[PDB]
Amino acid sequence: AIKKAHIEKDFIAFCSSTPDNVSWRHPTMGSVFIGRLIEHMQEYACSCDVEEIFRKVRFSFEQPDGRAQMPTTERVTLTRCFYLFPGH
Amino acid sequence: FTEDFQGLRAEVETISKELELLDRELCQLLLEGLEGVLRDQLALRALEEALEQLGPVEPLDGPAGAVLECLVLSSGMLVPELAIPVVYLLGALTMLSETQHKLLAEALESQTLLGPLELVGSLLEQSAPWQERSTMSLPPGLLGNSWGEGAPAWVLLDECGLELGEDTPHVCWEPQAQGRMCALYASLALLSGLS
């Protein structure tokens, strides 16, 4: 019994910045993208899906402060909503 | 195409380039099946008759069924996108002796395909044209430690029709060994792509 399947799906990429733009890091507190991602993940992993958490991270960068960076969600082939269940 | 080795290389690698449709899971299952098929004279004939180069094929037993269970749908229908690459492999195995079939099972088991794969490949390209007897000599870059009487690389070439030598020019190419040498390369090349 052999079935046919899509070559690639259920993927999602969350980039540090928009194309042709640079990311920004801080030697003391790490990157601004890595720091902001942990904050929202530790906060909204109990109610929001991953695709919505990434959208909330982009919302916190709507106001360009210092080195403006706009994370980008690319190559999305998720067929369902990825809900992390912390504690389960 | 061409009757050369580069025309055979393109003929063979077109069967491997689109064999990427086989998954990593199925590749190791097809490999574990072909290993047992190469150890049984009956299972190779039973598998070849089942494939038959339209209708659903009945399940088989033993290593023959292990290969066939990797190429049919739920209803038993053969998928032509994958069965034709396999029937080209068996079409190259019918032209080989049973002694060569066992030594392919040893190569598939101990992960030693790349040993005589390029050796046969380099012998098929330097022996052009295939219509003439030429006195060649393999380099020390292709093995030279395994070489000797009764060796896996020795028996695979002696069973093709080549008169081998331990010293001097080691290999003497005879035009009658053309059919089996191309089939021996096709078997090793297709199995290496599945690996």
Binding site: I7, F11, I12, N21, P86, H88 | -
Partner: protein, 167 residues
């Protein structure tokens, strides 16, 4: 730990609202999740990522608090990262897992992610699709129909990315 864990009252509420549109989560008593982090800090011809260690600790702690076994590899080239990715693609524990996380942190241009030996003259780039087709259903059947979250921290050009408008 630091992740505000989901209450079983709310975990039941979300699965009840849209059960057929959520990726199935395996039981914690038998699941073996995996997470891979590849971070290149110092380079042979490019300025060193000073402070890239706090990002490794932060992401590793986050993935461990979500139930993932984190594997961290530092300072690799585009071909050395490929060896660690394919070895990560046919791990045995993925068939008993339900998701995966891949974090890439290094320099990068428009083409992709830079390696250790990256220079202006001779590139050392691991393109994006190279990472994708390496963990696809073909090369990684143990993650078929399973979420594969890839997070990338790397530059993508040289422009500041800003524009001034009327206020």
């Amino acid at each position: 730990g630091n992740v505000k864990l989901c209450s079983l009252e709310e975990a039941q509420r979300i699965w009840k609202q849209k059960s057929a549109e959520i990726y199935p989560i395996m039981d914690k008593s038998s699941r073996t999740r995996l997470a891979l982090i590849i971070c290149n800090e110092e380079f042979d011809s490019i300025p060193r990522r000073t402070g890239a260690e706090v990002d490794i600790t932060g992401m590793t702690m986050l993935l461990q608090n979500l139930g993932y076994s984190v594997d961290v590899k530092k300072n690799l080239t585009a071909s050395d990262m490929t060896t660690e990715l394919e070895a990560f693609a046919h791990r045995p524990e993925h068939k008993t897992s339900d998701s995966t996380f891949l974090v890439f942190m290094s320099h990068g241009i428009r083409e992709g992610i830079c390696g250790k030996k990256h220079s202006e003259q001779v590139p050392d780039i691991l393109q994006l699709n190279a990472i994708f087709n390496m963990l696809n259903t073909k090369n990684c059947p143990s993650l078929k129909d399973k979420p594969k979250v890839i997070i990338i921290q790397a530059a993508r050009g040289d422009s500041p990315g800003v524009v001034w408008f009327k206020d």
